[PDB]
Design a binder for these strands. Sequence first.
RNA 1: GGGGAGCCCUAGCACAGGUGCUGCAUGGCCGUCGUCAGCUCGUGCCGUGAGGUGUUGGGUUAAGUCCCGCAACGAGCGCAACCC
Length: 235
Amino acid sequence: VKELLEAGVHFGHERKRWNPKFARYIYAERNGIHIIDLQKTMEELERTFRFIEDLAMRGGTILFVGTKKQAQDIVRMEAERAGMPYVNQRWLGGMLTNFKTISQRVHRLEELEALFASPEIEERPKKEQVRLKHELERLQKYLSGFRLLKRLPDAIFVVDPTKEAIAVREARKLFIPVIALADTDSDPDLVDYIIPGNDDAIRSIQLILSRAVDLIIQARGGVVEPSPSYALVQE
RNA sequence: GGGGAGCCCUAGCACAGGUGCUGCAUGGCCGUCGUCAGCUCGUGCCGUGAGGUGUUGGGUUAAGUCCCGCAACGAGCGCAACCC
């Protein structure tokens, strides 16, 4: 499944902007791109997906992060299929040191959902209502998937290794094992259980996250059908 | 017949009183900076630390009012706003 479908439509990318460690898990650099050695790909696939199966049988919280449009679409629906919080929006620097900040916004969000369905409609002048609508769409858009993150999330899949090494940075400081994906440019060793690949290829990520959902379901149950991407994959 | 209390007269004994100097000795109180929009703190990062960040970019507003990136998310005097 993996190696076959993988090579068939995806592997490496970027243009000699690479990272050292990358090169060791990689064959070639040829033409202008670094070519994913699918072997050890599948090796750490074994490590990581072992983890996945295990604590999917137990139950935990990991991210679907793609602050970039690409991944974004896919992961969002993946969340609305897997169950955990996701960060498609700009992951903000604060959560993993300022849990209380977010939790303030969050309890307040409970109260916001509350006062939405309330006789406070006609009351409190029109423009004011407009303002409250605006804060609504704020916390709504950003805290799209992530809204049900109660407790601490124990590992954090996520894509592109740079910005999402800012994400890595927070998780990493608060002693949290990183699962995550990377292309050519940035480093994987700040991650314990990495994933090399093409964070510019759409089919790659889709296959990965979709069958990873079906990995939690390989430990959970209910195996249905893959909808995300496909149509949105090449248009 | 006297003394005394309110009370009046002179002299004295305690002292009031003065728009005389000091707004670089003050209060309050204004003049200005200029409706100019700045000035800020709660949780946490960055540097050994002082300290920074917040608030520095792009449109845009009567405004740091706001939108997009954002070690940042909240709040203060403002700014707004209920009175006329």
